[PDB]
Design a binder for these strands. Structure first.
Lengths: 216, 488, 50, 98, 121
RNA sequence: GAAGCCAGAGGAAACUCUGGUGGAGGCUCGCUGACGUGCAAGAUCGUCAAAUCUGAGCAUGGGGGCGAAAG
């Protein structure tokens, strides 16, 4: 009861064939312009640089491992031996393979065989200005002709565009009511339930009690 | 035979994929070519066999598209597995959408196609194209029929809900169920609405060389660092998935309450009472006020809707966390107590009070009334700090309602008043004693407030009319009730 | 309706602002033409059509 | 048939001529008079493959016993683990005709 | 339910009323008799609606005159008068049965008075 | 003196008793406060601090309030 608690040579797929008869003979043998291609590699190192730099944090390695793939990504399918010039062995004490496979349980039970979403606080600031009578439709169109206008982003490489987006954010102020609208828009549905607010108040009361104990 | 020679060739493919799968990558596609035989039998045994191989072969991880010797061997075999499994799901879906009536010797293709789908749903889900698996199930669950395949598709989804801990499989299922219910304009069988109630997220010396010893040490520290990172990410992901599921679940709940679908809104209030404590604190008072607006709308069948929303409000404050937040969250149930008091005279007159393990979705109106009075008169919390005047107000009215109600309902009400005397005793003992009757004012039966009826200025005499009622269980009910009156 | 307000709390409207209209006390919402203008200014890809 | 395959095994132990264990199995194969070779499931693969190699060279049938070494010893009537065993004479059993 | 089998109700109601007068047993007819009254035909606006209206005035009567000497009559009758008080409100706002409406007015004037006149005993 | 082992006697067994072997232990010997729960007129349960000694080298943490945490 305490006992219960590069492949090797096999005779299974060689039994009852001419290959067994050949091997059992025992005769000797031995085994005897537009820059497309340059742009392919430049984006390959840039992706490799991004994944290497982002993987220096332990949180991202955990997020990437638990991240799934997208079916929107998988789309496209539908929608010499140098030779010399010179009854089975495995028996099962009982086709049998076809009988064995269809004696499985599963075969026996079967009988009768565009949306615009305002996420950034700065877009909220432009929304608060436009919706109130502070900035008109004429003022928004006229002030859109600035130095950040008429700049193309269509065929440009990802390493060029991501460098710009990090270093070309326009500096225009936001309002606190615009930022307040964004957090209350992006608040989750289980962010502030009765259980978590209760333990948060209990934790803060306990923390004051230890301070009074230490001052004692 | 023709049907014979497939069975070895079916067993030919599946057996070597079990032994060494990577050696043979066209055998998935070889399983496809042996499937379009016009003879109906091998269509059956192939679909089961494709279910058999993909259960054993599919790994525990998804595999990315290639894009762009042992590595090329693994890539060819894995990409062949995807193309086979994508094709099997297409031939599963067109087989389930096929015509159901056929010969009575066996169910034709469809129930085998559905039982293959439900087996894959609880064995595959992590692997790709689970939306294609689920879309077969949601399509049958929108058919609005009671049928064995409709039943079979039902336990598959709640098996998925009860067992899924990561939450990705549950989110894709509740997204399709939510989008189906709006597309159908809420004509579902309300077994699929109870599927949201089954969600789980909401609820001996081996020698080692010196190089092996140092590699196993560094692997331990790498796994140690990866353990706190995985624990923090899995916790943060679980809250986020719960946030998205709660948004889609509660949006379906409120759209049913707006559309006023009668059979559906009984199940919504059960889900609402179950899951309100998970959602934000500010929205708890909103739910208690949306229930008020529903009751006012029926006050403009209609007895069941008002009692359903009344017992749901009491079931919200039933919960432990909501009970401790009565002072902070100003949750006053005085509206539901007073509306229950004003409807007791009208409820005795209406004759559809008895029509043949949940809390809200009960069928008969009488037991909905019983559970409302159990909350008002016998609460689990503060049963000794109950206003005796509220006790005396309902005791007189329940005695009055027992006079003009069916036999089973009258026996139940006498059982309820029996429990009030045993629990409260001296508080309501003066009602049956006419010498302890107050003389402050007179009794107002037709009152719009619980406080203003002056219940202690009247005496209960319905026991004279009810020891004479034809049902002796009504007669036995009094003799049990007057027994505890004398036992005080 | 209270059910209507509780739906906007969960599924926020597209043109939602968080403001109150001075003319009517109802919450003030951006129109679809206004939301397109905000997108055009923010990204700056095309200042004006045609 | 697990129950029936232990029936002729118990008979051939108690009627025939059987050697038990790895080394005696090796010597029986070397003499060439072995007629059946039983190999347990939990036998190590290097021991498994060497035993399959000599049986091919000596032309004796093999059987891959489904049970482990303690299971084969219990089937023998013995109280020790037997990973491998060889039949030299079938005795009064039909274990060789099958 | 419903108006096609209405005469089957009234003979069956009288059989229960006969039983409750002989033996001293309570039989609740208040829910059933009012339900037959508040079906669609009375609230939809002619001789047969007067005939079913004048007849049901009777079945309201002997139901209340049986136990009109028992002490629990202020509380027994009370669900019934408040039911017809709503009914006087809807016809003041259905049919044009002024004769049927006037007969029920006297009936609830009766039930209130015997409720009042028993409270001093 | 714990499992475990040896021997003898009961019991169909499991176990029981005796005599020994063995030498595990949040066991002993030398010279209480702060809280929480409470669904009553406070009972009952749970958390926290008091944390092998020592030479030579070394790193980090500290206040308040707000907030669900992140900040």
């Amino acid at each position: 009861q305490m006992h219960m608690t590069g492949a090797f040579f096999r005779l299974k797929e060689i039994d009852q064939t001419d290959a067994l008869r050949r091997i059992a003979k025992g005769k000797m043998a031995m085994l005897t312009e537009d820059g497309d291609q340059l742009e392919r590699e430049l984006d390959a190192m840039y992706e490799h640089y991004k994944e290497r730099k982002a993987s220096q944090d332990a949180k991202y390695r955990a997020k990437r491992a638990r991240q799934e793939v997208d079916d929107e990504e998988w789309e496209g399918l539908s929608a010499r031996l140098e030779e010399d010039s010179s009854k089975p062995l495995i028996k099962d004490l009982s086709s049998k393979r076809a009988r064995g496979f269809f004696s499985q349980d599963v075969f026996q039970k079967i009988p009768g065989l565009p949306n615009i979403d305002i996420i950034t606080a700065e877009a909220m600031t432009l929304a608060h200005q436009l919706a109130t009578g502070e900035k008109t439709k004429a003022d928004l169109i006229d002030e859109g002709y600035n130095k950040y206008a008429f700049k193309q982003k269509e065929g440009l490489p990802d390493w060029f565009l991501e460098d710009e987006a990090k270093h070309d954010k326009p500096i225009k102020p936001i309002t606190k009511e615009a930022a307040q609208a964004i957090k209350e828009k992006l608040r989750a549905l289980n962010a502030r339930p009765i259980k978590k607010v209760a333990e948060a108040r209990a934790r803060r009361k306990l923390r004051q009690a230890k301070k009074l104990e230490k001052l004692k | 035979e023709q049907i014979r020679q497939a069975q070895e060739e079916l067993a030919k493919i599946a057996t070597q994929l079990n032994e060494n799968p990577e050696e043979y990558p066209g055998h998935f596609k070889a399983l496809a070519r042996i499937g379009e035989t016009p003879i109906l039998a091998i269509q059956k045994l192939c679909i089961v066999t494709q279910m058999a191989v993909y259960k054993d072969v599919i790994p525990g991880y998804r595999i990315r598209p290639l894009g762009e010797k042992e590595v090329k061997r693994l890539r060819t075999y894995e990409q062949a597995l995807v193309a086979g499994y994508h094709g099997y799901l297409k031939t599963l879906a067109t087989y389930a959408a096929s015509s159901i009536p056929e010969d009575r010797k066996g169910e034709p293709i469809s129930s085998i196609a559905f039982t293959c789908a439900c087996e894959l749903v609880n064995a595959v889900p992590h692997f790709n194209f689970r939306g294609d698996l689920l879309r077969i199930l949601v399509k049958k669950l929108s058919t609005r029929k009671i049928d064995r395949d409709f039943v079979k598709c039902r336990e598959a989804l709640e098996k998925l809900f009860q067992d899924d801990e990561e939450g990705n499989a549950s989110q894709e299922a509740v997204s399709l169920l939510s989008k189906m219910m709006k597309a159908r304009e809420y004509r579902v069988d309300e077994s699929v609405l109870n599927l949201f109630l089954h969600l789980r997220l909401l609820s001996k010396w081996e020698f080692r060389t010196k190089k092996q010893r140092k590699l196993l040490k560094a692997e331990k520290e790498a796994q140690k660092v990866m353990e706190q990172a995985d624990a923090t990410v899995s916790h943060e992901e679980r809250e986020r998935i719960q946030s998205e599921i709660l948004k889609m679940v509660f949006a379906t709940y409120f759209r049913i309450l707006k559309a006023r679908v009668p059979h559906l809104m009984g199940a919504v209030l059960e889900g609402l009472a179950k899951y309100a404590h998970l959602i934000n604190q500010d929205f708890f008072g909103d739910l208690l006020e949306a229930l008020k607006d529903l009751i006012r709308d029926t006050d403009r069948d209609t007895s069941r809707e008002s009692l359903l929303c009344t017992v749901t409000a009491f079931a919200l404050l039933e919960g432990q966390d909501a009970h401790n937040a009565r002072s902070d969250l100003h949750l006053d149930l005085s509206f539901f107590i007073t509306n229950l008091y004003r409807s007791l005279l009208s409820l005795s007159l209406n004759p559809d009070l008895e029509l043949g393990n949940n809390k809200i979705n009960l069928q008969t109106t009488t037991v909905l009334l019983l559970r409302c009075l159990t909350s008002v008169l016998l609460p689990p919390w503060n049963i000794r700090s109950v206003p005796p005047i509220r006790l005396a107000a309902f005791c007189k009215q329940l005695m009055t309602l027992a006079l003009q109600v069916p036999e089973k309902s009258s026996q139940a009400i006498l059982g309820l008043l029996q429990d009030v005397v045993h629990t409260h005793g001296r508080k309501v003992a003066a009602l049956w004693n006419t010498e302890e009757r107050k003389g402050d004012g007179t009794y107002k039966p037709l009152s719009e407030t619980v406080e203003g009826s002056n219940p202690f200025t009247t005496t209960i005499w319905e026991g004279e009319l009810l020891r004479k009622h034809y049902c002796p269980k009504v007669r036995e009910g009094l003799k049990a009730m007057e027994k505890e009156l004398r036992s005080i | 309706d209270a059910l209507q307000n509780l739906l906007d709390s969960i599924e926020v409207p597209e043109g939602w602002t968080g403001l109150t209209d001075p003319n009517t006390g109802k919450p003030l919402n951006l129109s679809r033409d206004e939301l397109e203008l905000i997108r055009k200014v923010q990204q700056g890809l095309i200042p004006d059509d045609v | 048939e697990a129950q029936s395959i232990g029936a002729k095994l118990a008979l051939v132990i108690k009627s025939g001529k059987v050697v038990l264990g790895y080394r005696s199995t090796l010597k029986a194969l070397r003499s060439g008079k072995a007629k059946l070779i039983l190999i347990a499931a939990n036998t190590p693969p290097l021991r498994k493959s060497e035993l399959e190699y000599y049986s091919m060279m000596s032309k004796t049938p093999v059987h891959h016993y489904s049970g482990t070494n303690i299971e084969l010893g219990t089937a023998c009537g013995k109280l020790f683990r037997c990973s491998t065993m060889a039949i030299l004479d079938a005795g009064d059993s039909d274990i060789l005709a099958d | 339910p419903t108006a096609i089998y209405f005469p089957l109700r009234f003979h069956l109601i009288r059989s229960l009323l006969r039983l409750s007068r002989a033996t001293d047993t309570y039989i609740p007819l208040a829910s059933a008799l009012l339900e037959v009254l508040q079906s669609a035909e009375m609230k939809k606006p002619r001789v047969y609606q007067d005939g079913v209206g004048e007849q049901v005035v009777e079945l309201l009567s002997e139901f209340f005159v049986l136990w009109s000497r028992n002490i629990a009559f202020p509380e027994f009758a009370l669900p019934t008068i408040v039911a017809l008080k709503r009914w006087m409100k809807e016809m003041r706002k259905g049919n044009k049965n002024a004769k049927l409406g006037s007969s029920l007015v006297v009936l609830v004037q009766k039930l209130e008075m015997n409720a009042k006149f028993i409270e001093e005993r």
